[PDB]
Amino acid sequence: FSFICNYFKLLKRQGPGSPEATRKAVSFINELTDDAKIADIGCGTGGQTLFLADYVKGQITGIDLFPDFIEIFNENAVKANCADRVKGITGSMDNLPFQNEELDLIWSEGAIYNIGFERGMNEWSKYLKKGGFIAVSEASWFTSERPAEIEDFWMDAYPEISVIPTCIDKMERAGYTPTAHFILPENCWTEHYFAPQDEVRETFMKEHAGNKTAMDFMKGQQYERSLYSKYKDYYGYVFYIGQKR
Numbered sequence: 001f002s003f004i005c006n007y008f009k010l011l012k013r014q015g016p017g018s019p020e021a022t023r024k025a026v027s028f029i030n031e032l033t034d035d036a037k038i039a040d041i042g043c044g045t046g047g048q049t050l051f052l053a054d055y056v057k058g059q060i061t062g063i064d065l066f067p068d069f070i071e072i073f074n075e076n077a078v079k080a081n082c083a084d085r086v087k088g089i090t091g092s093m094d095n096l097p098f099q100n101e102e103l104d105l106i107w108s109e110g111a112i113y114n115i116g117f118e119r120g121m122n123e124w125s126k127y128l129k130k131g132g133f134i135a136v137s138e139a140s141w142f143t144s145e146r147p148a149e150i151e152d153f154w155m156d157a158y159p160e161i162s163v164i165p166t167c168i169d170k171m172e173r174a175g176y177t178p179t180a181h182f183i184l185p186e187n188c189w190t191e192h193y194f195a196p197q198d199e200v201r202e203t204f205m206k207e208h209a210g211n212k213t214a215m216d217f218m219k220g221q222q223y224e225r226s227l228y229s230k231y232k233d234y235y236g237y238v239f240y241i242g243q244k245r
């Protein structure tokens, strides 16, 4: 991910979502206090972390593997006048810097796939307080059968993808009460994820026009939009909310 990550740090969001989606996910947890501790795993540049900060109270800690994203994250916190309660730090998903039952809420949008839905659910449970909440958005299937094309894509990119029922089953096994789930509206993909990339598509085309690897990356981005604008009825992002029992 050489220039791949330098490309995404130019976007407000590195994955599908929306202020409304983050807000809807919050409507399912309990109200927190300024002393509550929250963690946004795979926060990226923190686009959704700031939406979250607007809907909940407490000290938020953003964690991401790419340091360049954290730099932007902390820069945005300052600009947003909330760097005192919202801080970003580089870290790994399979080695979180928290103590047992330290957090009131675990947040993660389009990032848990990096360690697997099931694995994440179980391993992150340790860091959550009794009665605490977890909210993550994951790519899932909306039906039991779908076209081969979309399927081959996901079984290659993210083999752990599954139907909603299976995702909820794993939450229970992980010791979470399946509080709620909802499919993110399409605008979370087009308006907040794809559209933003088209804007910088021309400046990008002019700078990397003569570079194979770069241009290939472009075909990929375009192929994603095609898959979505043709299979949106068979898959998408889903928000899962659970409370640790």
Ligand SMILES: Nc1ncnc2c1ncn2[C@@H]1O[C@H](CSCC[C@H](N)C(=O)O)[C@@H](O)[C@H]1O
Pocket: 012, 013, 014, 015, 016, 017, 041, 042, 043, 044, 045, 046, 047, 048, 063, 064, 065, 066, 069, 091, 092, 093, 094, 108, 109, 110, 111, 114
């Ligand atoms: N092992 C790991 N530990 C922590 N973060 C990781 C990771 N592997 C990948 N990531 C981060 O997971 C994020 C997935 S993209 C989603 C970014 C942001 N949550 C958004 O919704 O806009 C990226 O920022 C990627 O850098």
